[PDB]
C-alpha cells in the first residue's frame, strides 16, 4: 500500500542504497533469495513492509527500487553481489561513460540519452503500484551523475508524477572522504535546479559521518562502507515509519507537513547512540541529549546559534513515552532550544518498538534503543554558506567553467544558481534572526 519507490543515482546513492536495502532486509527478515519466512501471505500482502518491497508468487520480496549510474561498475557489483537475487535486471540500469564529475555532462549530454529509459523502468514499478506515495531519491551533490541526472530526473518526475511527493537523501561534499575540485559547482547547480522539485531533503555531510566513524567507532581511516552503514541506519530510522506500523511519518506527505514550514525551507537537520561493540547502555535522557550534541549531527552546524522551527524525535527500541517526556523537560531547562516566535515549541515524538538491527561484522553495536532527531534550524544554512563561498572563490576566476560551457551550459546557469543560493541564505537569515 502507499508505496514508496526509491531511486538511487550515482555511486554514492547506489552504494548507500545497497546498504540501506540490506539493513532493510535484515530488519524485515527477508533473506537474500527474496524469501521472507514470516510472510504468511504468499504472493501478496498489503502489510507495511510492502511499501518498499513487492512480492512474487515464489515468495520473493522485491525491493521497489531502481539503481541508476552512467557507468557499469558499482551497479555491476550489486548485479553480482550477495543480494543480487533480490533485485531484478531492469531495476539496475547502467550506462557507458561517467560524467567526469561534471553536472553539465550528466544533466545534458549523457543524461538525455538515458532519461527516458530510466523513466520507463520507473513506470514499470509505478504500474505495479496501487497507490504510489512518491519517491525517495538518493544521490551525491558532487558527482556528475549524482548532480546532473538527479536534477533532470527530478524535473521529469515532477512532470510525469506531479501530485506525487519526492524526498531526498543527499551527500554533501566534504574535502576528506574524497572530493573532486568542482563538487562545489556541481552542488550549487543541482540544488538550484532541484529546489522546487523536492519536498524534503535530508543532507548528510560526509565530514560529520567521517568524524563519528573515527571518534565513536575508532576507525582510523573510515571506508565508504563504514560510512554508508552508518548512513543507512539513519536512513532506516527515517524510513521505518513507512515500513512499520506507526502513526508518525507514515506518509511521505507527513514529513513535509511536520518538518517543512515554507516550501524552500525544506532541509531538516538530522542527529542520531553510535557505539562500538566494545557495554554502558545509554538512557532515553542520555540519547535524547546527544540529539542535542552538535557532534552527533549529520551536518556540522551550531544550532544554538540559530533558531528552531520544527523538531521530531523518532525512537527505536526500549523507549516509553514517559521517559521521553521527562528527558525533554530536563533538556529544555539545561540546553538552549530557542524557537522562532511563530512556531510552537513542542517536540513531535514517535516510537517504533522494533529494535535496531546491525549488519553482522559491522562496526556498530546492536543497541537496545536509539533515536534520530529531525529539526528545522536556520543553522543548516551554514552548510550552504561554506559551499557558496567555495563556489565563489572558483567562479570569480571562472576556474573549470570551460568544462561546463564545452558541454552546452552557459555561464549564466552558474550565476542564476548562485543567486538562487543567495536567495536561500537570506530566507534563512530571515526566518532565523
Amino acid at each position: 500500500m502507499r508505496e514508496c519507490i526509491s531511486i538511487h543515482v550515482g555511486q554514492a546513492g547506489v552504494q548507500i542504497g545497497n546498504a540501506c536495502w540490506e539493513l532493510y532486509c535484515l530488519e524485515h527478515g527477508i533473506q537474500p533469495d527474496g524469501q521472507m519466512p514470516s510472510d504468511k501471505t504468499i504472493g501478496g500482502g498489503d502489510d507495511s513492509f510492502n511499501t518498499f518491497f513487492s512480492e512474487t508468487g515464489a515468495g520473493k520480496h522485491v525491493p521497489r527500487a531502481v539503481f541508476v549510474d552512467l557507468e557499469p561498475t558499482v551497479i555491476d557489483e550489486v548485479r553480482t553481489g550477495t543480494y543480487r537475487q533480490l533485485f531484478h535486471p531492469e531495476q539496475l540500469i547502467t550506462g557507458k561513460e561517467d560524467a567526469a564529475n561534471n553536472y553539465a555532462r550528466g544533466h545534458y549530454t549523457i543524461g538525455k540519452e538515458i532519461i527516458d529509459l530510466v523513466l520507463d523502468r520507473i513506470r514499470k514499478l509505478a504500474d505495479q503500484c496501487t497507490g504510489l506515495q512518491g519517491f525517495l531519491v538518493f544521490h551525491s551533490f558532487g558527482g556528475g551523475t549524482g548532480s546532473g541526472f538527479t536534477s533532470l530526473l527530478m524535473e521529469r518526475l515532477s512532470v510525469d508524477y506531479g501530485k506525487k511527493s519526492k524526498l531526498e537523501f543527499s551527500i554533501y561534499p566534504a574535502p576528506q572522504v574524497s572530493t573532486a575540485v568542482v563538487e562545489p559547482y556541481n552542488s550549487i547547480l543541482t540544488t538550484h535546479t532541484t529546489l522546487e522539485h523536492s519536498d524534503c531533503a535530508f543532507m548528510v555531510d560526509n565530514e560529520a559521518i567521517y568524524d563519528i566513524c573515527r571518534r565513536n567507532l575508532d576507525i582510523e581511516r573510515p571506508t565508504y562502507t563504514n560510512l554508508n552503514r552508518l548512513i543507512s541506519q539513519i536512513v532506516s530510522s527515517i524510513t521505518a515509519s513507512l515500513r512499520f506500523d506507526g502513526a508518525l511519518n507514515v506518509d511521505l506527505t507527513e514529513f513535509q507537513t511536520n518538518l517543512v514550514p515554507y516550501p524552500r525551507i525544506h532541509f531538516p537537520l538530522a542527529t542520531y547512540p553510535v557505539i562500538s561493540a566494545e557495554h554502558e547502555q545509554l538512557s532515553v535522557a542520555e540519547i535524547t541529549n546527544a540529539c542535542f550534541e552538535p557532534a552527533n549531527q549529520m551536518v556540522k552546524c551550531d544550532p544554538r546559534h540559530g533558531k528552531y522551527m520544527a523538531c521530531c524525535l523518532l525512537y527505536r527500541g526500549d523507549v516509553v513515552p514517559k521517559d521521553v517526556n521527562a528527558a525533554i523537560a530536563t533538556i529544555k531547562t539545561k540546553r538552549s532550544i530557542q524557537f522562532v516566535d511563530w512556531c510552537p515549541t513542542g517536540f513531535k515524538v514517535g516510537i517504533n518498538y522494533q529494535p535496531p538491527t546491525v549488519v553482522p561484522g559491522g562496526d556498530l553495536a546492536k543497541v537496545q534503543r536509539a533515536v534520530c532527531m529531525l529539526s528545522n534550524t536556520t543553522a543548516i544554512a551554514e552548510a550552504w554558506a561554506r559551499l557558496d563561498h567555495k563556489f565563489d572563490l572558483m567562479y570569480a576566476k571562472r576556474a573549470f567553467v570551460h568544462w561546463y560551457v564545452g558541454e552546452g551550459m552557459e555561464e549564466g546557469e552558474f550565476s542564476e544558481a548562485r543567486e538562487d543560493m543567495a536567495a536561500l541564505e537570506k530566507d534563512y537569515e530571515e526566518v532565523g534572526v
Partner: protein
Amino acid sequence: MYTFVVRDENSSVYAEVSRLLLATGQWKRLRKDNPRFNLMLGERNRLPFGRLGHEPGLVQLVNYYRGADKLCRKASLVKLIKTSPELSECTWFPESYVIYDEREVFLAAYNRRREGNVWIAISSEASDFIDEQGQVHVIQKYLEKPLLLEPGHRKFDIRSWVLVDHLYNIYLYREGVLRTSEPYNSANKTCHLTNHCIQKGRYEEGNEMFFEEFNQYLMDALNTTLENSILLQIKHIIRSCLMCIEPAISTKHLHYQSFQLFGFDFMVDEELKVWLIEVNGAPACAQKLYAELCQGIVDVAISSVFPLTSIFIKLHH
C-alpha cells in the same frame, strides 16, 4: 610551526599578540582569507564562525566567542540580566529599561521615584533625547551617590580585563585600571563622564589610576582593602555574567574552539558597593599593561591549544 591569520587591524591587543606570536619563531602569519590556519584573530563584525572547524586535520581557534554579544551590547545585556533565572530580575546592576519595548514600566518607576530620580541614556525629567536621536537605547538609573576620590572630589570607573580560554576557565588580570574624572557636581557636565575620551591629567597620568594607588587610598582613607571592599564583588559579578551564558557560547564539544578577552566596567558607590555598568567585547588596554596582558593571552589562551606568579586570578576551574 603554527599558522595564524589577522583580520582586525585595529585591535591594539591582538596587534601585540600577533607581534609576539611572530617573535616566538614557531608561528607564521598567513594572508587573511587563507583557510588553512591554526588560529584566527578575526574581525569584530560578521566574523564567519560558520566556516571554522572544517579544515581537515587543522585544529582551529578563534579569539571571539560567538554569542557573547548578548553581554556586550547594552540593550542585549539588559534583556539578558532581566530575563535570566540565574540573574533574578540582581543587586549589582542598576535598574534598567529598554526603549525604542518597555516604556510604561520606566514611567511607572519614575513616578514611584518622583514621589520624594536621575536617569541616563543624563537628566532628571523623563525627556525623548532618544527619539530626537538614533538607535534602540536603554534608560538606566544614574548613580547619584558615587564614591568620590577625595583628594580631588572625583568620579571614577574601574575596568577589569577577563580572559575566557577554550575550556571556559575565567581569568581576571591582576592589573585593572581606574579611569578618573574636573570634580563632581550634583547639579550639572563633562566630569560626570569618566571616559578618557571626554576627559581629554592633574592627579593621575592620563587620568588613570592603577591598583596599587587605589589600594593605598582605601587603606589610608577608609581602613579597607581593594580586595575586601571591591574585588570580591567584581569577581562575583564576572562569574555571574559569564557562567550565565556559558551553555550558549561554550565551544566545549564544537568543531572549532574559542577564547576571548572582555573588559568589564564597574562603578563603586559611597557605601563601597560595586555595580556593573557595561561589558565590552573588544577592549583596549592601559598602555603600561599592554605588554603583560598580551603575553598572558598567548600564555593561557593560545599556547594552551598550540603548545610551544601567574598574572591571572582563576575565577573558574
